[PDB]
Design a protein around this ligand. Structure first.
Ligand SMILES: [Zn+2]
Ligand SMILES: [Zn+2]
Ligand SMILES: [Zn+2]
Ligand SMILES: [Zn+2]
Length: 169
């Protein structure tokens, strides 16, 4: 609506708010673009810290965390939606391409929710499934090996949770 903050208004807020607000609006973002938006005043060590609080690494790009889109209060409990979306996001760490029917079969969620999860980080491609919306960011990955390894361990934790509640493979 009309209640959107301009970038100059955004840049007067605490750094944690800027990153949260940007990522919730723009759900997928390359790190270098986030740095550009926040402006030349900010240091990247603080942004590397801040982005991991609110987003996960996917294909070298940053994707806003599910609990930001679906906070604990939508008649479906927020944790059920978070789990479904986290599954989709997990699938995209494995591959740029995701088959909608596999998401429906595994999450057993409503077709509207499955579409909601996919369409805000991917677009359907004719006869090939849903393709993650940003290209693989090989440059961020090359330049931040420590963060990439950490994020891969965090995904290890998330996948273990998903394997407990869902029936993967
Ligand atoms: Zn989550
Ligand atoms: Zn619903
Ligand atoms: Zn939308
Ligand atoms: Zn990985």
């Amino acid at each position: 609506p009309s209640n959107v903050l301009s970038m100059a208004q955004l840049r007067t807020l605490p750094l944690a708010d800027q990153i949260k607000i940007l990522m919730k609006n723009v759900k997928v973002m390359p790190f270098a673009n986030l740095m550009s938006l926040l402006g030349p005043s900010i240091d990247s060590v603080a942004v590397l810290r801040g982005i991991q609080k609110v987003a996960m690494l996917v294909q070298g790009n940053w994707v806003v965390k599910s609990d930001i889109l679906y906070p604990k209060d939508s008649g479906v409990p927020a944790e059920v939606l978070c789990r479904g979306r986290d599954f989709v996001m997990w699938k995209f760490t494995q591959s740029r391409w995701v088959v909608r029917k596999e998401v429906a079969t595994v999450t057993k969620l409503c077709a509207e929710d499955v579409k909601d999860f996919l369409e805000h980080m991917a677009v359907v491609r004719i006869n090939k499934g849903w393709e993650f919306i940003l290209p693989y960011d090989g440059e961020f990955i090359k330049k931040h090996p420590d963060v990439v390894q950490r994020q891969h361990m965090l995904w290890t934790g998330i996948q273990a949770k998903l394997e407990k509640v869902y029936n993967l493979v």
